[PDB]
Design an enzyme around this catalytic site. Structure first.
Site, mmCIF file in Angstrom:
data_model
loop_
_atom_site.group_PDB
_atom_site.id
_atom_site.type_symbol
_atom_site.label_atom_id
_atom_site.label_comp_id
_atom_site.label_asym_id
_atom_site.label_seq_id
_atom_site.Cartn_x
_atom_site.Cartn_y
_atom_site.Cartn_z
ATOM 1 N N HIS A 126 0.926 -1.357 0.160
ATOM 2 C CA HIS A 126 0.084 0.236 -0.129
ATOM 3 C C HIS A 126 0.662 1.426 -0.045
ATOM 4 C CE1 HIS A 126 -3.840 -2.081 1.955
ATOM 5 N NE2 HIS A 126 -3.613 -3.067 0.582
ATOM 6 N N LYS A 143 -14.583 -8.456 -8.291
ATOM 7 C CA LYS A 143 -13.748 -9.331 -8.688
ATOM 8 C C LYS A 143 -12.970 -10.221 -7.900
ATOM 9 C CE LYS A 143 -10.783 -7.434 -12.039
ATOM 10 N NZ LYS A 143 -9.799 -8.538 -11.494
ATOM 11 N N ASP A 144 -13.036 -10.202 -7.103
ATOM 12 C CA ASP A 144 -12.287 -11.127 -6.080
ATOM 13 C C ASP A 144 -12.919 -12.449 -5.801
ATOM 14 O OD1 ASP A 144 -10.216 -9.471 -6.460
ATOM 15 O OD2 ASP A 144 -9.928 -9.212 -3.810
ATOM 16 N N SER A 159 -0.587 -0.997 -6.983
ATOM 17 C CA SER A 159 -0.082 -2.256 -7.349
ATOM 18 C C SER A 159 0.418 -1.443 -9.107
ATOM 19 C CB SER A 159 -1.557 -2.770 -7.856
ATOM 20 O OG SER A 159 -2.068 -3.005 -6.517
ATOM 21 N N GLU A 168 5.681 -34.416 -3.946
ATOM 22 C CA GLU A 168 4.028 -33.362 -4.449
ATOM 23 C C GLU A 168 4.468 -32.541 -5.527
ATOM 24 O OE1 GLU A 168 1.219 -34.075 -3.484
ATOM 25 O OE2 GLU A 168 1.095 -35.348 -2.215
HETATM 26 C C1 HEM Z 1 1.268 -16.910 1.786
HETATM 27 C C2 HEM Z 1 1.315 -15.598 1.067
HETATM 28 C C3 HEM Z 1 1.375 -14.388 0.043
HETATM 29 C C4 HEM Z 1 0.284 -14.228 0.262
HETATM 30 C C5 HEM Z 1 -1.318 -13.677 1.313
HETATM 31 C C6 HEM Z 1 0.381 -12.836 -0.851
HETATM 32 C C7 HEM Z 1 -0.433 -11.180 -1.083
HETATM 33 C C8 HEM Z 1 -0.787 -10.730 -1.634
HETATM 34 C C9 HEM Z 1 -1.833 -9.103 -1.983
HETATM 35 C C10 HEM Z 1 -3.628 -9.413 -1.347
HETATM 36 C C11 HEM Z 1 -1.146 -8.461 -2.805
HETATM 37 C C12 HEM Z 1 -2.358 -7.966 -4.061
HETATM 38 C C13 HEM Z 1 -2.970 -8.279 -4.992
HETATM 39 C C14 HEM Z 1 -2.609 -8.988 -5.958
HETATM 40 O O1 HEM Z 1 -1.685 -8.137 -6.632
HETATM 41 O O2 HEM Z 1 -3.115 -10.202 -6.165
HETATM 42 C C15 HEM Z 1 0.344 -9.408 -3.273
HETATM 43 C C16 HEM Z 1 1.190 -8.949 -4.218
HETATM 44 C C17 HEM Z 1 2.326 -8.699 -4.237
HETATM 45 N N1 HEM Z 1 2.886 -9.800 -4.337
HETATM 46 FE FE1 HEM Z 1 1.962 -11.302 -2.845
HETATM 47 N N2 HEM Z 1 1.603 -12.790 -1.481
HETATM 48 C C18 HEM Z 1 1.797 -13.986 -1.275
HETATM 49 C C19 HEM Z 1 3.477 -13.420 -1.658
HETATM 50 C C20 HEM Z 1 4.188 -13.214 -2.665
HETATM 51 C C21 HEM Z 1 5.106 -14.440 -3.479
HETATM 52 C C22 HEM Z 1 5.663 -15.538 -2.701
HETATM 53 C C23 HEM Z 1 5.738 -12.767 -4.349
HETATM 54 C C24 HEM Z 1 6.869 -13.334 -5.002
HETATM 55 C C25 HEM Z 1 8.203 -13.945 -4.973
HETATM 56 C C26 HEM Z 1 5.196 -12.307 -3.915
HETATM 57 C C27 HEM Z 1 5.829 -10.271 -4.388
HETATM 58 C C28 HEM Z 1 3.964 -10.026 -4.894
HETATM 59 C C29 HEM Z 1 4.473 -8.585 -5.610
HETATM 60 C C30 HEM Z 1 5.366 -8.458 -5.929
HETATM 61 C C31 HEM Z 1 3.309 -7.883 -5.154
HETATM 62 C C32 HEM Z 1 2.818 -6.568 -6.239
HETATM 63 C C33 HEM Z 1 1.990 -6.818 -7.463
HETATM 64 C C34 HEM Z 1 1.390 -5.531 -7.943
HETATM 65 O O3 HEM Z 1 1.175 -4.851 -7.516
HETATM 66 O O4 HEM Z 1 1.414 -5.939 -9.020
HETATM 67 N N3 HEM Z 1 3.869 -12.143 -2.934
HETATM 68 N N4 HEM Z 1 0.936 -10.167 -2.428
HETATM 69 C C1 LIG Z 2 8.256 -34.928 4.165
HETATM 70 S S1 LIG Z 2 7.485 -35.450 2.408
HETATM 71 C C2 LIG Z 2 6.756 -34.864 1.836
HETATM 72 N N1 LIG Z 2 6.487 -33.182 1.936
HETATM 73 C C3 LIG Z 2 6.239 -32.496 0.538
HETATM 74 C C4 LIG Z 2 4.701 -32.160 0.342
HETATM 75 C C5 LIG Z 2 6.732 -31.075 0.907
HETATM 76 C C6 LIG Z 2 8.663 -31.059 0.561
HETATM 77 C C7 LIG Z 2 9.252 -30.411 0.743
HETATM 78 C C8 LIG Z 2 8.644 -29.146 0.376
HETATM 79 C C9 LIG Z 2 7.219 -28.047 0.739
HETATM 80 C C10 LIG Z 2 6.601 -29.556 1.060
HETATM 81 C C11 LIG Z 2 6.660 -33.480 -0.895
HETATM 82 O O1 LIG Z 2 6.380 -32.826 -1.828
HETATM 83 N N2 LIG Z 2 7.093 -34.462 0.073
HETATM 84 N N3 LIG Z 2 7.870 -35.261 -0.615
HETATM 85 C C12 LIG Z 2 8.638 -36.099 -0.714
HETATM 86 C C13 LIG Z 2 9.502 -37.411 -1.444
HETATM 87 C C14 LIG Z 2 10.956 -37.306 -1.874
HETATM 88 C C15 LIG Z 2 11.509 -36.512 -1.675
HETATM 89 C C16 LIG Z 2 11.409 -35.033 -0.624
HETATM 90 C C17 LIG Z 2 10.301 -35.011 -0.594
#
Ligand code: HEM
Ligand SMILES: CSC1=N[C@@](C)(c2ccccc2)C(=O)N1Nc1ccccc1
Ligand SMILES: CCCCCCCCCCCCCCCCCC(=O)OC[C@H](COP(=O)([O-])OCC(O)COP(=O)([O-])OC[C@@H](COC(=O)CCCCCCCCCCCCCCCCC)OC(=O)CCCCCCCCCCCCCCCCC)OC(=O)CCCCCCCCCCCCCCCCC
Ligand SMILES: CCCCCCCCCCCCCCCCCC(=O)OC[C@H](COP(=O)([O-])OCC(O)COP(=O)([O-])OC[C@@H](COC(=O)CCCCCCCCCCCCCCCCC)OC(=O)CCCCCCCCCCCCCCCCC)OC(=O)CCCCCCCCCCCCCCCCC
Ligand SMILES: CCCCCCCCCCCCCCCCCC(=O)OC[C@H](COP(=O)([O-])OCC(O)COP(=O)([O-])OC[C@@H](COC(=O)CCCCCCCCCCCCCCCCC)OC(=O)CCCCCCCCCCCCCCCCC)OC(=O)CCCCCCCCCCCCCCCCC
Ligand SMILES: CCCCCCCCCCCCCCCCCC(=O)OC[C@H](COP(=O)(O)OCCN)OC(=O)CCCCCCCCCCCCC
Ligand SMILES: CCCCCCCCCCCCCC(=O)OC[C@H](COP(=O)(O)OCC[N+](C)(C)C)OC(=O)CCCCCCCCCCCCC
Ligand code: HEC
Ligand code: HEM
Ligand code: HEM
Ligand code: HEM
Ligand code: FES
Ligand SMILES: [Cl-]
Ligand SMILES: [Cl-]
Lengths: 49, 67, 75, 61, 49, 241, 377, 125
Positions: G199, G225-226, G203, G269
């Site tokens: 914020h 939309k959400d 965005s 997985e």
């Molecule tokens: C539990 C994990 C996460 C949650 C709940 C989350 C949630 C959100 C939400 C609600 C927004 C704003 C709305 C949208 O753009 O969809 C956002 C934006 C963003 N997120 Fe996440 N996110 C998560 C993980 C991540 C990850 C894994 C990355 C990158 C590696 C990331 C990077 C960003 C960026 C760069 C934005 C800005 C996007 C924009 O406004 O154009 N976030 N996130």
């Molecule tokens: C703990 S067993 C496990 N946990 C998961 C869900 C996981 C691993 C790593 C990160 C997130 C989730 C997955 O794919 N495996 N299986 C598995 C099978 C072979 C080798 C490693 C993991």
């Protein structure tokens, strides 16, 4: 694992220079006919067949 | 003494062209290795191919006879 | 945060809008919709499709090799 | 020039939010009966004589 | 110069009951509102269920 | 590390997305497990009460539980003793532990069957094909005594002798107890054992699809309704000259 | 107006109602809220599973069984939680891909903690999959925890200290359950800091150009939309729950854990298969582990690799193609990861593994420099 | 000055550093932070107990025993958690008594949710 004579002379007549963890069969076991290991791979813990 | 819907379908399954060919390739392998026993060349591969084409056609119409 | 009335500067721009109860929510949904989807896919297909076709060819070759690499040879 | 059904629904039910909400809760009550009634009737007509509801009459005694 | 302005035509988006610029919009105001609010009511029914 | 042959797909009457199990075939399948399989295979997670209202009445399932004797206690003297089963008892285990099981089955362990369909790729297709798929070994394969050839088992050498055959039992409803019949009924029962929620989940699945077919276009319509203000807005730029 | 002055509803107002948002953000911007929903679902289904699950090896397998058979509607709760986790990872990967294609990573603070949000979810789902205590649970837990044995000097100490023994056993299953319980709340806290930094700027949008000249309020436009997006999220989940619950689950996990023999072929997985492939692509212990860490920590240094004078790829065809060659390449590594270390999957896994790091580190940075010169700046 | 403009450290600054506070608040105003500390202690000791405790009647009694005898320094963790809970309730009752004697309840919103904080701690313990 009870090792036979077909196996002792296979792992005794091996070059040790290129081994990754080099050591002759003497250091490993106590007696030439017995190999007592532990079943885990040194990579990431799976048991070898 | 008692019939079997399983056995009747298999005899009318091995008649189609795709199944007799697998039978001919394993009947050759039945006589190839048993020419004189010595080798280590089993003959499991040519059997599993015959079962693949066979058990495909049984599943089609086998269940039409059961309850 | 950021508020309305402190975003940016705009001049000489007029916006006409209609109430949502005065107009249709699905106007020409298929009449104008499909030709627009064709234009959108046409415009991007050459940038998206090739790498996923490339994946498809590797995927079939790799399995085709592996599925038969463990077959036996007469030797 | 009698108002259509949609216009008479608005004047009587929807204009006030309270009456708009009352008919949602009542609409939910009567929708629930007829939906689970009709839906279950389809699920078993497909699977006629396949599950316990149908063969219950054999093993009564 | 602001009198040169004219609102553009919206006939491509107007509903049937409105395109007549010589017919009152209040004659259809209750049917049009009712249709859109009927969509909302049946939606909350399903979410309620 | 041998060659594999995977099972074909048989047209089970519960295969379809909305298709329930056939409960008469379940009923017959329980009879196969009791008479033939239960002497080598446990089912540690199924109890007699689970049968009630699926394929037997409460009175029928109670009578079935009392046909076996199970251990209970202690009594007031501190001794364990035996009484007939009740609805709350799990199906008797054939062996106290797996070590006794290997000794009674030439060293092999019959697994618990509660989940067998879910713990092997191909489910009932695999089990149906395995039971009905025994045959003589191909030329050049010679299995050690104690083991039996079965081409669907990994390695093709299984420690279970063929357990079913024509007339191993007689069914209560007169159905001919053919090998294929016995396989089909026991497989349907084993699916139920591994997934008792099968029928109920499909009934819910139908309701979920119908509600979504209603709610998705209505919610879509609400989105388009509000957004129409913007989607048809018109802009004009009138700078001073 | 009380909506704007109550100290509690003020923070809600500035985040969901009167928040200015761009007028042109597409469906790829829906996945932020779907991540929040996914998290909420995993809290609730997770919580109601924890009321019937027991955390010890003797009955850990049986307590999950007890849920799917005996407790009212616990089987549906359990598959929601299992498939909810997979939907979580779908949304995660769309979320990141959106950020890369449209250049949202230039929000350094938001992006760099987003990376942290990715790691903690992986750590959660990892410690969740151990709890049912099946075969895949046990040996998948064994392969992962032994990655720390590759650290020189202090490796074995950290593993046995994590284990509470000499192998994954009763002591691990208990603490992993404790960690799996508490981490999803830490996630929610960091997700709140995710929004706080977001914020600060607002965005991005499909064009990469500032949308200050044309903003609309979040309500009613993006609230609805959400909702619509969430209703499609429920659809995806319920199709998996009610028509294919064991499609993504492996059969081997339906046999209690056996610490004495492995399955002939283990596969994570789907949401971890691309990274498992990178690990196996190297015939070295410490090398494979480092290549696995950098496979994910590569995201932290994307912002340092931005060369284009434009932000989004919408107007950069040469970057688009390299972007989709990365998705296909990642889709390739996923396929290898699900296949046994055998010919030709081995060599394919290495070529796709180089192509992954080659694209991010070389081809895409220089591809942006080209198209800058094609546009004369 | 970054302490006043970083969006994260801003909220810390306005709560623990540059926050204006009265010059004359006595030791009875110390119990607000001691409640926070008590909570943190109950989180940490609580968390490290949950890594060795099992939740079923057959071994629930025995798993606590297992902590006080077998796990390194678990007996001290367990008594910290047990006595930490009692210290929590000492601080709670001083906190409330401070509020009544000195009239702090006129902060309705703060006070009325304080009541909620009392109920949830009781439900926890
Ligand atoms: C539990 C994990 C996460 C949650 C709940 C989350 C949630 C959100 C939400 C609600 C927004 C704003 C709305 C949208 O753009 O969809 C956002 C934006 C963003 N997120 Fe996440 N996110 C998560 C993980 C991540 C990850 C894994 C990355 C990158 C590696 C990331 C990077 C960003 C960026 C760069 C934005 C800005 C996007 C924009 O406004 O154009 N976030 N996130
Ligand atoms: C703990 S067993 C496990 N946990 C998961 C869900 C996981 C691993 C790593 C990160 C997130 C989730 C997955 O794919 N495996 N299986 C598995 C099978 C072979 C080798 C490693 C993991
Ligand atoms: C389910 C899996 C679907 C994968 C998504 C495929 C791409 C897509 O169409 O997104 C739809 C949808 C449309 O969003 P948008 O805001 O209108 O445009 C987003 C991009 O800018 C879109 O980029 P674009 O502007 O370059 O256009 C790409 C084009 C793509 O159009 C197509 O490729 C569809 C062609 C099918 C023709 C009909 C043959 C039957 O998008 C459309 O025209 C809308 C799809 C219409 C579907 C009609 C199907 C009948 O985007 C998404 O939801 C992406 C996430 C979907 C993942 C779901 C998996 C769970
Ligand atoms: C995992 C879950 C992932 C969640 C993804 C989040 C998706 C989201 O929140 O945004 C939905 C986002 C909303 O699209 P929109 O509000 O119509 O605006 C699209 C643009 O204005 C683009 O304007 P346009 O004029 O190019 O729009 C083309 C038109 C599609 O044009 C067509 O008419 C293609 C249909 C061919 C059927 C031929 C039959 C004759 O609309 C669409 O692209 C939506 C396709 C959905 C078709 C469903 C059947 C109705 O796109 C969708 O995917 C709508 C799907 C909603 C299901 C409706 C079922 C009834
Ligand atoms: C341990 C249990 C102690 C219960 C607290 C007793 C009251 C008290 O002295 O608070 C000390 C302490 C002094 O705080 P303050 O800011 O200087 O004044 C607070 C009131 O305004 C104080 O109200 P005040 O201004 O009307 O004065 C009351 C007076 C109370 O003075 C006394 O009653 C002590 C008389 C003992 C004489 C020496 C005989 C040995 O406070 C003092 O003069 C300071 C105590 C000096 C202790 C010297 C002991 C030797 O207040 C507290 O810490 C109250 C919470 C203690 C609960 C601890 C239980 C765990
Ligand atoms: C690290 C995790 C690895 C796990 C492996 C997962 C398996 C991968 C399976 C592949 C599924 C692909 C989903 C379908 C994508 C279709 C996109 C398309 O139809 O349109 C292209 C679109 C172009 O549109 P513009 O925005 O340029 O302008 C529009 C003008 N009308 O451009 C855009 O819409 C693109 C926006 C971003 C798409 C997100 C997909 C990427 C997923 C993984 C990325 C991870 C990278 C580290
Ligand atoms: C102890 C037991 C108690 C049980 C009580 C049961 C009560 C049931 C609900 C009834 C309340 C109805 C209130 C109402 O409809 O107003 C809310 C808004 C207004 O709609 P709108 O059409 O904007 O304005 C109507 C104006 N009017 C009344 C003059 C015609 O209506 C809508 O806009 C709502 C439509 C969207 C609903 C979806 C919201 C759920 C979240 C997302 C779900 C999917 C993913 C989680
Ligand atoms: C009802 C007729 C039965 C069905 C269905 C199955 N069996 Fe058995 N079983 C027995 C042994 C000694 C084993 C272990 C074999 C080994 O580990 O090599 C088994 C194993 C199975 C399996 C597992 C197959 C697999 O792991 O892929 C299945 C699916 C199976 N059995 C089905 C022994 C006996 C037995 C003792 C005489 C009887 C009566 C049955 N099995 C009956 C059934
Ligand atoms: C982002 C949040 C979460 C994710 C991604 C997640 C993921 C998972 C996964 C993948 C499993 C394996 C399920 C299986 O294989 O059967 C699992 C199991 C489990 N989870 Fe979670 N979880 C989350 C949050 C929670 C929370 C907050 C709780 C409890 C308060 C919880 C409690 C459990 C329990 C008790 C199990 C074991 C029962 C089972 O296997 O179904 N989870 N989780
Ligand atoms: C977990 C529970 C609680 C925590 C962590 C907590 C914490 C705090 C803190 C840090 C302060 C400010 C510093 C101080 O005055 O000591 C405060 C003030 C206050 N609290 Fe609490 N408190 C809790 C429960 C309660 C309860 C149970 C009540 C009343 C029934 C309450 C009512 C108040 C009031 C009225 C104030 C203002 C005091 C003043 O500034 O004079 N709180 N609380
Ligand atoms: C304000 C926070 C908390 C309070 C007041 C509290 C209080 C208590 C009390 C009074 C007991 C009884 C101890 C006994 O009789 O031996 C207990 C036990 C326990 N608590 Fe908490 N607790 C809190 C937070 C937590 C948290 C956050 C966790 C775990 C993440 C936790 C885990 C446990 C466990 C596992 C036990 C059983 C072991 C034992 O009895 O020592 N507690 N708690
Ligand atoms: S080779 Fe990696 S675990 Fe044995
Ligand atoms: Cl299970
Ligand atoms: Cl005790």
């Amino acid at each position: 694992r009870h090792r036979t004579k077909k196996e002792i002379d296979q792992e005794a007549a091996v070059e040790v220079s290129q081994l990754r963890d080099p050591q002759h069969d003497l250091e490993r076991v106590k007696k030439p006919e017995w190999v007592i290991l532990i079943g885990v791979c040194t990579h990431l813990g799976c048991v070898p067949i | 003494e008692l019939v079997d819907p399983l056995t009747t379908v298999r005899e009318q399954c091995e008649q189609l062209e795709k199944c007799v060919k697998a039978r001919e390739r394993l009947e050759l392998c039945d006589e190839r290795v048993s020419s004189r026993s010595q080798t280590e060349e089993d003959c499991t591969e040519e059997l599993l191919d015959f079962l693949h084409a066979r058990d495909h056609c049984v599943a089609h119409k086998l269940f039409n006879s059961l309850k | 945060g950021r508020q309305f009335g402190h975003l940016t500067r705009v001049r000489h721009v007029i916006t006409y809008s209609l109430s949502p109860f005065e107009q249709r929510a699905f106007p020409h949904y298929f009449s104008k919709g499909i030709p627009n989807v064709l234009r959108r896919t046409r415009a991007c297909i050459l940038r998206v499709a090739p790498p996923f076709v490339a994946f498809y060819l590797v995927y079939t070759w790799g399995t085709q090799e592996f599925e038969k690499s463990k077959r036996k040879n007469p030797a | 020039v009698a108002p259509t059904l949609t216009a008479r629904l608005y004047s009587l039910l929807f204009r006030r939010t309270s009456t708009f909400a009352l008919t949602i809760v009542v609409g939910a009550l009567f929708f629930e009966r007829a939906f689970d009634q009709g839906a279950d009737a389809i699920y078993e007509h497909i699977n006629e004589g396949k599950l316990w509801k149908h063969i219950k009459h054999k093993y009564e005694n | 110069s602001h009198t040169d302005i004219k609102v553009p035509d919206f006939s491509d988006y107007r509903r049937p009951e409105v395109l007549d610029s010589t017919k009152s919009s209040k004659e259809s105001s209750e049917a049009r509102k009712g249709f859109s609010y009927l969509v909302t009511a049946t939606t909350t029914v399903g979410v309620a269920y | 590390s041998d060659l594999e042959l995977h099972p074909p797909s048989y047209p089970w009457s519960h295969r379809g997305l909305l298709s329930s199990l056939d409960h008469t075939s379940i009923r017959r399948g329980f009879q196969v497990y009791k008479q033939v399989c239960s002497s080598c295979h446990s089912m540690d997670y199924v109890a007699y009460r689970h049968l009630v209202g699926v394929c037997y009445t409460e009175d029928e399932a109670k009578a079935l539980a009392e046909e076996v004797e199970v251990q209970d206690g202690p009594n007031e003297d501190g001794e364990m003793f035996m009484r007939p089963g009740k609805l709350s008892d799990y199906f008797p285990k054939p062996y106290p532990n797996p070590e006794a099981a290997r000794a009674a089955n030439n060293g092999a362990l019959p697994p618990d069957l509660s989940y067998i369909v879910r713990a092997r790729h191909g489910g009932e297709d695999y089990v149906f094909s395995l039971l009905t798929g025994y045959c003589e070994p191909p030329t050049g394969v010679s299995l050690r005594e104690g083991l039996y050839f079965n081409p669907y088992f990994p390695g093709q050498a299984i420690g279970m002798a063929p357990p079913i055959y024509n007339e191993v039992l007689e069914f209560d409803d007169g159905t001919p107890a053919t090998m294929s019949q016995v396989a089909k009924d026991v497989c349907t029962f084993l699916r139920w054992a591994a997934e008792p929620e099968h029928d109920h989940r499909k009934r819910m699945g139908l309701k979920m699809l119908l509600m979504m077919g209603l709610l998705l276009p209505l919610v879509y319509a609400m989105k388009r309704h509000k957004w129409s203000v913007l989607k048809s807005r018109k802009l004009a730029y009138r700078p001073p000259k | 107006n009380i909506r704007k002055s109550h100290p509690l509803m003020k923070i809600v107002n500035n985040a969901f109602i009167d928040l200015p948002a761009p007028s042109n953000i597409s469906s790829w911007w829906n996945f932020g809220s779907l991540l929040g929903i996914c998290l909420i679902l995993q809290i609730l289904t997770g919580l109601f599973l924890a009321m019937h699950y027991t955390s010890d090896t003797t009955t850990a397998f049986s307590s999950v069984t007890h849920i799917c058979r005996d407790v009212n509607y616990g089987w549906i709760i359990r598959y929601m939680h299992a498939n909810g986790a997979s939907m979580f990872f779908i949304c995660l990967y769309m979320h990141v891909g959106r950020g890369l294609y449209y250049g949202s990573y230039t929000f350094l603070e938001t992006w760099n903690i987003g990376v942290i949000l990715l790691l903690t979810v992986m750590a959660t789902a990892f410690m969740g999959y151990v709890l049912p205590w099946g075969q895949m649970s046990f040996w998948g837990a064994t392969v992962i925890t032994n990655l720390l044995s590759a650290i020189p000097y202090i490796g074995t100490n950290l593993v046995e200290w994590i284990w509470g023994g000499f192998s994954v056993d009763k002591a691990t299953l208990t603490r992993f359950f404790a960690f799996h319980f508490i981490l999803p709340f830490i996630i929610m806290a960091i997700a709140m800091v995710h929004l706080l930094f977001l914020h600060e700027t607002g965005s991005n949008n499909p064009t990469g150009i500032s949308s200050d000249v044309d903003k609309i309020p979040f309500h009613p436009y993006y609230t609805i939309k959400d909702i619509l997006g969430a209703l499609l999220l429920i659809l995806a989940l319920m199709l998996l729950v009610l028509f294919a619950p064991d499609l993504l689950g492996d059969p081997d996990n339906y046999t209690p854990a056996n610490p004495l023999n492995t399955p002939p072929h283990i596969k994570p997985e789907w949401y971890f298969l691309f990274a498992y492939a990178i690990l196996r692509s190297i015939p070295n212990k410490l090398g494979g582990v480092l290549a696995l860490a950098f496979s994910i920590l590569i995201l932290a240094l994307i912002p340092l690799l931005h060369t284009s004078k434009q932000r989004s790829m919408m107007f950069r065809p040469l970057s688009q193609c390299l972007f989709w060659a990365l998705v296909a390449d990642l889709l390739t590594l996923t396929w290898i990861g699900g296949q046994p270390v055998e010919h030709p999957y081995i060599t394919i896994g290495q070529l796709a593994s180089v192509l992954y790091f080659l694209l991010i580190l070389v081809l895409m940075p220089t591809a942006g420099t080209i198209e800058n010169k094609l546009l004369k700046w």
